């Protein structure tokens, strides 16, 4: 019955990630008062710190031993209370004569490392949770659907509680502070309670199974040998290379659409749950993709998943606006990003099996794969934000105002549609990874022959 119990673990990370990524800048500029300078600095440093901490926490997990508890479950146990206090505390605005601004940076970086410390073992646990591929893939698909539903939940709850989550605008020319602060605090409290209840229900039942007797129990080296052998392995890098382009394109989309919806080809000044609609459609879709990969999902699932975005998204080439069909396009993109989330993230256990049987004696190297994978996801986030900001700066958007020049529309139209079209095209072309259905069954044979 543990399948749901493990699946719920994605929500505590995902809801906070979404809430922060969508609201922290607005809160920093408005509810607290920080200059645009320091706001940009805090955001950039927080993301950079997250990327930097990801491999290091991965290493400390790899080094950590099994002492009177789960191999990596004490990491969740150490993370949950401190991370929840940090997430609550960051939202509160400190009243101080001096040094007020640092508080935000410190508690943002600290909460971020703590939540990565939660996430990475939770991602790695899919290998351990059960040995057979069928239940393994079941559990990972369940985790992914609950994670995307966590995205939906976090965005919806924060928006509804704190009021309309819209890009602020400066009307063209030709409700108390403590009350809105208390609103943000209520949001922090309910999201923290969701985090705590999710972590406890997750920890209550997974009861990871310890490793069987290993062929080489002595002489493992965590600092170097793991990295060296992972670099020696080639399908893993081929997989992450193929996944990087797809993930970058779709995160670029999800990021810049927030301003596309108003400034360019937007008949509504408010997104009004459009993002919630597309993400909920993705959450509904993901089980269909799991079953689809049951029915010849070797590589067809990723082909159809990435390719389905192309025609519906490019329907902006016709560009003649009609809001209801545009909503339909958003739903289409929902099922496309559902495939983009579920497939490559859960293909990885097959790669780790192929590496595991290829070289026997190397043991305990599993968390390195997951750590570097989530690190490359964060790196894609960084480069997506960088290209978006650089393009917008270089063309248009000299000032934030309700009226925007025509240039912004050209750059941000081509950016939102054509750049992800070409990016997913190249990624999908380069995505001809080594293991297919034949390869998985062949690895399966050796797996069952080992012990």
């Amino acid at each position: 019955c543990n399948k749901l119990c493990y699946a719920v673990g994605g929500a505590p990370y995902q809801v906070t990630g979404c809430a922060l990524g969508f609201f922290l800048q607005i809160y920093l500029l408005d509810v607290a008062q920080v200059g645009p300078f320091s706001a940009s600095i805090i955001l950039f440093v927080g993301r950079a710190w997250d990327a930097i901490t990801d491999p290091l926490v991965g290493f400390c997990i790899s080094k950590s031993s099994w002492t009177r508890l789960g191999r990596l479950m004490p990491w969740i146990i150490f993370s949950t209370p401190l991370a929840v206090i940090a997430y609550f505390l960051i939202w509160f605005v400190p009243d101080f004569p001096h040094g007020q601004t640092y508080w935000y940076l410190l508690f943002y970086c600290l909460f971020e490392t703590l939540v990565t410390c939660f996430h990475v073992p939770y991602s790695a646990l899919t290998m351990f949770i059960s040995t057979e591929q069928s239940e393994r893939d079941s559990a990972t698909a369940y985790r992914m659907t609950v994670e995307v539903l966590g995205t939906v939940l976090g965005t919806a709850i924060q928006g509804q509680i704190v009021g309309q989550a819209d890009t602020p605008c400066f009307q063209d020319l030709n409700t108390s502070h403590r009350e809105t602060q208390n609103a943000y605090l209520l949001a922090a409290g309910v999201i923290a309670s969701i985090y705590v209840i999710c972590a406890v229900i997750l920890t209550l039942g997974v009861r990871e199974q310890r490793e069987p007797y290993e062929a080489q129990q002595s002489e493992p080296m965590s600092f170097f040998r793991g990295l060296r052998l992972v670099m020696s392995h080639g399908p893993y890098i081929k997989l992450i290379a193929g996944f990087l382009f797809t993930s970058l394109a779709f995160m670029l989309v999800e990021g810049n659409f927030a301003l596309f919806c108003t400034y360019t080809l937007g008949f509504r000044n408010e997104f009004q749950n459009l993002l919630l609609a597309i993400m909920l459609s993705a959450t509904l879709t993901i089980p269909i993709w799991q079953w689809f990969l049951t029915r010849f999902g070797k590589k067809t699932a990723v082909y159809v998943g990435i390719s389905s975005a192309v025609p519906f998204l490019i329907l902006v080439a016709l560009m003649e606006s009609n809001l209801i069909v545009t909503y339909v396009v958003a739903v289409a993109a929902g099922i496309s990003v559902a495939a983009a989330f579920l497939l490559p993230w859960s293909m990885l256990p097959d790669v780790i099996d192929d590496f595991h049987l290829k070289q026997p004696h190397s043991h305990g190297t599993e968390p390195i794969f997951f750590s570097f994978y989530v690190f490359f996801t964060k790196f894609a986030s960084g480069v997506s934000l960088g290209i978006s900001t650089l393009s917008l700066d270089f063309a248009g958007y000299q000032t934030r105002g309700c009226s925007q020049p025509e240039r912004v529309k050209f750059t941000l139209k081509m950016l939102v549609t054509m750049a992800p079209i070409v990016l997913i095209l190249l990624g999908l072309l380069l995505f001809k990874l080594y293991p297919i259905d034949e390869e998985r069954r062949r690895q399966n044979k050796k797996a069952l022959q080992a012990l």
Partner: protein, 265 residues
């Protein structure tokens, strides 16, 4: 010809406010927007149609010595025609330096915004000293435009202008509201009320005001100017053209340099 000191009271002026954002501002979007809205609806009675500036009639003027002329000089301000000291009987000089930034209390701001008070009139020595202890003229008509910048309701003082109408019908000035009232001197009596906005008040208040707020930031706290709104005055009655030099303006710019009397024809 120039209007009578009584006509200065009777004539009505309307004021037009134009708002301009600060380009460098990129923060405090929601609170600055709410503040702009509350300021915008703070002024209930304004000129709806966009005002017209510039010399309008520019005839070779025929005029007598003027009873009141207003002179303002600024570093960088629009210039309007000048009349020498001989022409005007008495003079009020606008001096902006006396104005200082006062804190405009807003509901949602960790650092309260500051605005500049309107300028003040000054007069040469010995012209308004006759107190004569006559406050009772203080009451104006009802006016709903009380606010931070503009308060025609408060009646602190009324003092006589000695150099005008000593024998009878003495003219009183309330400096606090920079407004003036005319009396007729007869035991039996009838007397008019003031318009909501005096022409003299409209002339004096006409300067752009910059709202500033301070935001906590790295390397110390920083000053960000939210926005600034220009104010221009326009007569709302026939004639009443601002004679200034030879020129005859219908309305006055945001910062105006020169000497102006309100006249006819």
């Amino acid at each position: 010809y120039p209007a009578s000191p009584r006509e200065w009271t009777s004539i009505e002026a309307e004021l037009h406010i134009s708002y301009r954002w600060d380009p460098n501002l990129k923060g405090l979007m929601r609170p600055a927007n709410s503040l702009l809205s509350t300021v915008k609806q703070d002024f209930p009675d304004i000129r709806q149609k966009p005002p017209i500036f510039g010399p309008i009639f520019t005839n070779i003027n025929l005029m007598g010595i003027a009873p009141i002329c207003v002179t303002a000089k600024r570093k960088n301000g629009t210039n309007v025609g000048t009349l020498p000291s001989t022409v005007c009987n008495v003079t009020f000089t606008v001096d902006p330096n006396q104005q200082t930034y006062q804190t405009y209390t807003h509901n949602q701001f960790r650092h309260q915004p500051r605005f500049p008070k309107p300028p003040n009139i000054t007069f040469p020595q010995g012209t308004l000293l006759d107190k004569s202890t006559r406050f009772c003229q203080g009451r104006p008509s009802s006016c709903s435009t009380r606010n931070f910048w503009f308060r025609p309701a408060d009646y602190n003082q009324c003092l006589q202008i000695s150099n005008l109408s000593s024998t009878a019908e003495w003219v009183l000035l309330d400096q606090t509201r920079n407004s003036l009232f005319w009396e007729n001197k007869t035991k039996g009596a009838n007397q008019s009320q003031t318009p909501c906005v005096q022409v003299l008040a409209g002339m004096t208040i006409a300067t752009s005001y910059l709202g500033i707020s301070a935001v906590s930031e790295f390397f110390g706290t920083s000053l960000t100017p939210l926005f600034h709104f220009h104010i221009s005055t326009c007569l709302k009655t026939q004639g009443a053209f601002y004679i200034c030099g030879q020129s005859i303006h219908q309305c006055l710019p945001s910062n105006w340099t020169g000497t102006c009397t309100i006249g006819y024809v």
